[PDB]
Ligand binder design. Structure first.
Ligand code: CDL
Ligand code: LPP
Ligand code: LMT
Ligand code: TRT
Lengths: 55, 68
């Protein structure tokens, strides 16, 4: 039975990991966009077009 | 259509014209001889690029803040 438990646990773990990390990353991105859209001195490719994306 | 006097510029006798002065030892100064002193802007072009960028950006910043 612990095989079933571990399978369910790690499936739920992977689901939570993917979902929560994607949501948190997108949320930080959106907050940054809100900070920069209201301050167009910063609404620039401030890190770089490829630098941030590559990282 | 017009008499020869008007064309040649004189009725009877052609009058001598005083020639143009030259001012030896220096460049002529006329309305058309000014590019010797004033060329097209060539010294601060890259500064022009920078200042245009910064002007656009600062104007956009303050305009957006005012509008919001
Ligand atoms: C384009 C229309 C003309 C194209 C061909 C004619 C031509 O370019 O002759 C040179 C012609 C005049 O010669 P010039 O002495 O080099 O002019 C100085 C530049 O305007 C000084 O500005 P700049 O061109 O050296 O740099 C300004 C910079 C500024 O970048 C920005 O921040 C603007 C962001 C816009 C979004 O903009 C850009 O270079 C590229 C971004 C897009 C503009 O320059 C231009 O017209 C091109 C720039 C004009 C952009 C706005 C036009 C309205
Ligand atoms: C405003 C001052 C006019 C700037 C003209 C630049 C220049 O030196 O003048 C140069 C330009 C011509 O440039 P080009 O030689 O490249 O064709 O115009 C002239 O030659 C005379 C302009 C007379 C008008 C004066 C105003
Ligand atoms: C064609 C149908 C019938 C109509 C005929 C008449 C048409 C008239 C309109 C054209 C006028 C042209 O006018 C023209 O002006 C110039 C001024 O630069 C005159 O120019 C004249 O005076 C200048 C100085 O002022 C002299 O240095 C020059 O040697 C002499 O030519 C010409 O002599 C005249 O021909
Ligand atoms: C608003 O427009 C201003 C109109 O007035 C123009 C002012 O002109 C005065 C220019 O003064 C000088 C005088 C001498 C020179 C020299 C002879 C030094 C230039 C040189 C060495 C390139 C020939 C340059 C500028």
């Amino acid at each position: 039975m612990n095989w079933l438990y571990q399978m369910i646990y790690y499936g739920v773990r992977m689901w939570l990991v993917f979902v929560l990390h994607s949501f948190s990353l997108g949320s930080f991105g959106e907050l940054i966009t809100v900070i920069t859209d209201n301050n167009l001195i910063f609404n620039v490719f401030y890190i770089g077009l490829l630098g941030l994306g590559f990282i | 259509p017009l008499p020869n006097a008007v064309v040649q510029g004189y009725t009877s006798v052609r009058g001598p014209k005083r020639p143009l002065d030259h001012f030896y030892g220096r460049t002529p100064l006329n309305i058309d001889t000014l590019w010797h002193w004033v060329k097209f802007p060539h010294r601060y072009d890259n500064l022009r690029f920078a200042v245009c960028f910064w002007a656009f950006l600062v104007s956009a910043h303050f305009a957006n803040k005012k509008q919001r």
